[PDB]
Design a protein around this ligand. Structure first.
Ligand SMILES: *[C@@H]1O[C@H](CO)[C@@H](O[C@@H]2O[C@H](CO)[C@@H](O)[C@H](O)[C@H]2NC(C)=O)[C@H](O)[C@H]1NC(C)=O
Ligand SMILES: *[C@@H]1O[C@H](CO)[C@@H](O)[C@H](O)[C@H]1NC(C)=O
Lengths: 246, 596
């Protein structure tokens, strides 16, 4: 639900944002702190996923500096938020011909919801001065109401699935990041290489020395790299500077 | 304890279930109308009782709120309807007696049976039959008998029921802080908001009749013309100085006079506006007709028609086993759902009717952002007027030529345009005086200023002067002409039908005023005119949020109700009929009668 929006922690993996961006089945995908093109380039510690199904009209309400029945009581999003949200039509999945009543939204709240805060309380809302013992009466109401998603509901009213991606930058080591570029191995030509940050120019040949199962690269003396193990076939290469002279 | 803030919470709580339950009821009604079956009959009541019982407790809660200090105009307007409990102002016995008398008054009308004297077992009903006997025929005996049977076997048996119903309805209306019952009907044409735009029920009463005297030269001449032509049609039946009976009107009540257009055609050799061969030649089925009309709607500037309408709506004939009504209806089930229910046929009249239904759809979706209690027209006379504006704009030969329907070398001129305008006027200005006198009669019957003896003898002796239709036969007070009507047994307001067309013409003038179109008003077209949309757009989205007094400001500068376009639209027909009625004296002498 939206007042009880689920929270999932994603860390210690690689994120495939390209397949998420290229997909054309997503109704809404807009954000400003990070442009989607460069999202795979730079990465953070971990991410938070919040999945809930909302009405089509309310989709625009989930944005920084917004207020509404959802943006103020069911979910509050801080103005300094980074990342963005994926919304897509789910009328044929979430809704049913008899009317989906399995989703609920908070309508009343004495205190406005705080950013990145979820309130699961179901206290009997009180408006007037009448003493109510948790029972409905003159002006004592309920903070939660239900969705009535139906297949015959028009656009802006059909059940749309919405996943909020919250990005955070703790001082702890970053875990989730983007993929590689791979390219292709070429030998016996003065080229330049970037083997896991081992940036440098040279010519790569085949060698015969044996690394123990845990080294990554060797060196000989005066701290100059002399051999590298490729991270794909686990073979020992060699490095020679392409010639120069007067 | 504040009341203003908690009123909004109560409104939201009421709405959250109000839209849902109204949507369920609308879906059930559409299901029943689309396909009828025994199962789909009892569920209608099973939903209607719940919907009605939902309206009682919300108004029950709408008495503890002191609606005298709430400052928000929107909140005050919204809770004004909330305090309206409805029929809970009298005793339960009186309420059930009134419900029973309404039901029996409707059923007696629904069981009308009149048989021919020669064959005692051959009766005819409101279905095609005795109504058609005097609708399209050239006779004076069968028409006389049919009208006599209708006015004697219907209305006379309903007389005591109406007698009790009038006083009961007046009494229950008095308990709602109302001086009468007609005041409740006039409450729609009433605003108590901003100063300078305020309106009163008595203001409506006076302004609905000060808008009637400006059409006297337009009407009387026409009457004389009709009378004059009736002289060439029915010699030695009516004196040239008198007035015609109700049998020759063409309808059981003479509301529509277009049935005599073909009989009284000036130039019968000139063909009328016919495109039937054009409709059938290239197979104009219902879908492509609706799509071309939608293209015209887009050319007006209206928002794009919503996807899914082509799917849910059943455009064609319902079929053979799935019985359904053929009443042209445009359903707005809510929550973004729109549908249409019509028995489509390839006619120009059905073309205009489809235009009307889609105009209703557009107007309905115009105020979708309103709260649950504000998705209604600012008055009764905008929905029908908005729908009929499109019908009026779709009949111009300019648009018909623009859609490849008429020959490019056509010879439209003054004679055929005058004939078409006469056909239009027999429907347009052919209803004003009878409607006005009917509504006035209902009003002082509601008021009670006329006693129990001046009810039926007054009806004809005032119809003689308001319209000019002679009493074909002697009658006593046991007769009741008005009771033999659709909008008298179901308690339906009829004043809407008076201003409605006027609104059209006002808009039909005002838009034309903002159209840069030179020539006659009838030939004025709004096709390919984006500027003609936004003026309308400034009011359609208003809905019931703003009173109609201020709503009638973005289209017409004048906020009053002055009858400008009736003397503006029908200028050539009137100036040609002045030439036509040079010798025939206009007006009717209320002394000649068939019996004396
Ligand atoms: C990553 O690199 C390749 C990518 O597929 C895989 O290793 C080779 O996989 C191919 C077929 O997928 C085999 O024919 C080779 O024999 C594999 N070589 C080695 C050295 O594994 C595998 O998915 C990954 N390999 C490693 C070492 O992580
Ligand atoms: C309306 O929507 C239809 C369906 O996509 C489209 O073909 C058409 O171009 C739209 N017209 C306008 C004016 O938006």
């Amino acid at each position: 639900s939206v007042y009880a929006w689920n929270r999932k922690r994603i860390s210690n993996c690689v994120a495939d944002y390209s397949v998420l961006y290229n997909s054309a089945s997503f109704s809404t995908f807009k954000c400003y702190g990070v442009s989607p093109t460069k999202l795979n380039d730079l990465c953070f510690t971990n991410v938070y996923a919040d999945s809930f199904v909302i009405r089509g009209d309310e989709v625009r309400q989930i944005a920084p500096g917004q207020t509404g029945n959802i943006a103020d009581y069911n979910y509050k999003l801080p103005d300094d938020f980074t990342g963005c949200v994926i919304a897509w039509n789910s009328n044929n999945l979430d809704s049913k011909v008899g009317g989906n009543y399995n989703y609920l939204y908070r309508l009343f709240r004495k205190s406005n919801l705080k950013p990145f805060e979820r309130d699961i309380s179901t206290e009997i809302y009180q408006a007037g001065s009448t003493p109510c013992n948790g029972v409905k009466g003159f002006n004592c109401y309920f903070p939660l109401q239900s969705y009535g998603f139906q297949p015959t509901y028009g656009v802006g009213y059909q059940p749309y699935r919405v996943v909020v991606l919250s990005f955070e930058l703790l001082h702890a080591p970053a875990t989730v990041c983007g993929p590689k570029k791979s390219t292709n191995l070429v030998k016996n030509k003065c080229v330049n290489f970037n083997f896991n940050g081992l940036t440098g120019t040279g010519v790569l040949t085949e060698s015969n020395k044996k690394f123990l199962p845990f080294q990554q690269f060797g060196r000989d003396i005066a701290d100059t790299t002399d051999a590298v193990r490729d991270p794909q076939t686990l073979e020992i290469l060699d490095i020679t500077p392409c010639s120069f002279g007067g | 304890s504040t009341i203003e803030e908690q009123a909004k919470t109560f409104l939201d709580k009421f709405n959250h279930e109000a839209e849902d339950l109204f949507y369920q009821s609308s879906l059930a009604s559409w299901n029943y109308n689309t396909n009828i079956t025994e199962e789909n009959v009892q569920n209608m009541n099973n939903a209607g009782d719940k919907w009605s019982a939902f309206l009682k407790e919300q108004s029950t809660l709408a008495q503890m709120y002191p609606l005298q200090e709430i400052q928000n105009l929107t909140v005050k307007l919204q809770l004004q309807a909330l305090q309206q409990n409805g029929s809970s102002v009298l005793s339960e016995d009186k309420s059930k007696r009134l419900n029973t008398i309404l039901n029996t008054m409707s059923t007696i009308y629904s069981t009308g049976k009149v048989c021919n004297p020669d064959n005692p077992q051959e009766c005819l009903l409101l279905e095609p039959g005795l109504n058609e006997i005097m609708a399209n025929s050239l006779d004076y005996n069968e028409r006389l008998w049919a009208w006599e049977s209708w006015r004697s076997e219907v209305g006379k048996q309903l007389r005591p029921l109406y007698e009790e119903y009038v006083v009961l309805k007046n009494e229950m209306a008095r308990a709602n802080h109302y001086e009468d019952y007609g005041d409740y009907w006039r409450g729609d044409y009433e605003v108590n908001g901003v100063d300078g735009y305020d309106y009163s029920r008595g203001q409506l009463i006076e302004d609905v009749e000060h808008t009637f005297e400006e059409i006297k030269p337009l009407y009387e001449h026409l009457h004389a013309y009709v009378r004059a032509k009736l002289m060439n049609a029915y010699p030695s039946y009516i004196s040239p100085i008198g007035c015609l009976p109700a049998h020759l009107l063409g309808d059981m009540w003479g509301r529509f006079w277009t049935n005599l257009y073909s009989l009284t055609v000036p130039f019968g050799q000139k063909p009328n506006i016919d495109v039937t061969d054009a409709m059938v030649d290239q197979a104009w089925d219902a879908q492509r007709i609706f799509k071309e009309a939608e293209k015209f709607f887009v050319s007006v500037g209206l928002p794009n028609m919503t996807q899914g309408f082509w799917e849910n709506s059943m455009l064609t004939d319902p079929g053979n086993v799935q019985k359904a009504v053929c009443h042209p209806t445009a359903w707005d089930l809510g929550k973004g759902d729109f549908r249409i229910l019509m028995c489509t046929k390839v006619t120009m009249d059905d073309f205009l009717t489809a235009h009307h239904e889609m105009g209703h759809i557009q107007y309905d979706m115009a105020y979708a952002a309103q709260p649950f209690l504000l998705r209604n027209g600012a008055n009764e006379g905008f929905h029908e007027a908005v729908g009929e504006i499109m019908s009026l704009s779709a009949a111009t030969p300019k648009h018909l030529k623009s859609i490849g329907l008429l020959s490019p070398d056509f010879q439209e001129d003054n004679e055929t345009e005058i004939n078409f305008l006469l056909k239009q006027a027999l429907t347009i200005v052919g209803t004003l005086p009878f409607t006005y006198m009917l509504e006035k009669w209902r009003w002082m019957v509601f008021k009670g200023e006329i006693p129990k003896d001046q009810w039926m003898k007054k009806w004809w002796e005032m119809k003689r002067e308001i319209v000019g239709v002679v009493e074909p036969v002697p009658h006593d007070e046991t007769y009741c002409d008005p009771a033999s009507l659709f909008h008298v047994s179901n308690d339906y307001s009829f004043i809407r039908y008076y201003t409605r067309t006027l609104y059209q013409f006002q808009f039909q003038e005002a838009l034309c005023q903002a159209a840069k179109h030179e020539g006659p008003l009838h030939k004025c077209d709004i096709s390919n005119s984006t500027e003609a949309g936004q003026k309308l757009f400034n009011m359609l989205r208003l809905g019931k949020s703003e009173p109609w007094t201020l709503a009638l400001e973005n289209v017409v500068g004048a906020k009053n109700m002055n009858v400008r376009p009736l003397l503006n639209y029908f200028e050539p027909l009137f100036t040609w009929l002045k030439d036509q009625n040079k010798n025939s004296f206009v007006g009717w002498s209320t002394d000649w009668s068939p019996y004396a």
